């Protein structure tokens, strides 16, 4: 039955060893601290709150291999010197970035705060702000001497803020190190948008509150939808022609699946796989799949039609067979 075939492809395909995910997680905290050491000592007027370790790795929803890191460096910013513009509210018209705009320069001029030196025409510029962190990360830190202290291979990516990491043999870790403003549940990062006019803008990370959405449903039925989660971002981890597909994308078909369907039983895994299919399927035909948080956003909005109909059409013809998807 499929029931059975997916959850022996979670058994034996999705699901990470728990050394292996351990092991990562130490390459990481290890990779933290030398920045955080570094910064408090060659940067120490820089606000910054306490860099922490992010991503699906800390929620329990990493598939296959521990592979991927987000490290978070939050920056300080004075409550009456700066505003954080959604930009579906700006002319551009932008949903899913932000304007980070420098506020009242008539009664706290230039240079009250450290961060104007990264601002721009008003805004702090996530490009300025992540050429700091560049110069830093990538220019200043002994990463070869580091690696071997820990006998790691550390080395930034040419993307100079994303470091690679080989913590064993052939084992590899990526780590982003985002500059980023924390916005509640939400968070602002220096990651440009795939178009180039949509620069000065920061990327608004929705993953915090997605997964706790997420995790929140699950809690209250002791449901499946983490499950199916994990399942699918396996198949698309393990599929080149699915390789274009997201996390964040993926959790958004589930979240509106559970708007529209209350029984995420164990038994039913099975029934919301293909259902979750079929969702995304719908999605890439209209070309969008919104936000089940922010409606506005379309999270297909950075995909290309070529790109939109490779998935699509390999989803479509897998439905005649859905085995072929769990590698066989």
């Known amino acids: 039955s499929l029931q059975e075939k997916l959850l022996s492809y979670y058994r034996n395909r999705a699901a990470i060893p728990a ?5 990562a997680k ?8 030398e920045l955080a050491s570094f910064l408090r ?41 700066w505003s954080c513009i959604p930009g579906e509210d700006t002319i551009m018209n932008v949903p899913g970035f932000f304007l980070v705009r420098r506020e009242n320069p008539e009664y706290f001029p230039r240079g009250s705060s450290y ?9 702090l510029s996530p490009k300025t702000v992540a050429d700091t962190f560049e110069k830093v990360v990538a220019g ?38 985002l500059p980023s403003v924390t916005l509640g549940d939400t968070v602002l990062v220096a990651r440009p948008h795939r178009l180039a006019q949509y620069d000065n803008l920061w990327r608004l990370s929705l993953r915090p509150a997605e997964t706790a959405r997420l995790r929140a449903l699950d809690q209250a039925d002791s449901g499946c939808r983490s499950l199916c989660l994990k399942i699918l971002k396996a198949i698309c981890k393990s599929t080149p022609a699915l390789g274009h597909l997201t996390a964040s994308q993926l959790t958004n078909v589930i979240l509106h699946l559970a708007q529209e369907e209350a029984d995420w039983s164990p038994d039913m895994l099975a029934d919301r796989f293909l259902q979750a299919l079929r969702g995304l399927i719908s ?4 070309g969008v799949l919104p936000s089940a948080l922010n409606p506005k956003v379309n999270l297909f909005a950075e995909l290309t039609p070529q790109e939109i109909d490779e998935l699509g059409y390999t989803l479509y013809c897998s439905l005649s067979e859905p085995e072929v998807l769990l590698q066989t």
Not at 26 to 33: G, N, R, S
Request: include cysteine; glycine fraction near 4%.
């Open 140 to 177: 200043s830190i002994n990463w070869p001497a580091i690696g071997s202290l820990l006998d790691y291979v550390i080395r930034p990516a040419p993307e100079a803020l994303t470091l690679e990491v080989q913590y064993e043999k052939d084992k590899h870790l990526v780590i982003d190190f």
């Open 283 to 286: 999605y890439l035909e209209a």
């Open 115 to 123: 961060w104007d030196r990264c601002v721009v025409g008003g805004y």
């Open 26 to 33: 130490q390459a990481a905290v290890d990779i933290c601290a």
């Open 41 to 81: 000592a060659k940067l120490p007027d820089m606000p910054l709150a306490a860099m922490y370790l992010s991503g699906s790795l800390y929620d329990d929803l990493q598939v296959v291999t521990a592979d991927h890191i987000q490290l978070i460096v939050p920056l300080v910013l004075e409550a009456a010197l």
């Open 19 to 23: 050394g292996e995910q351990a092991r």
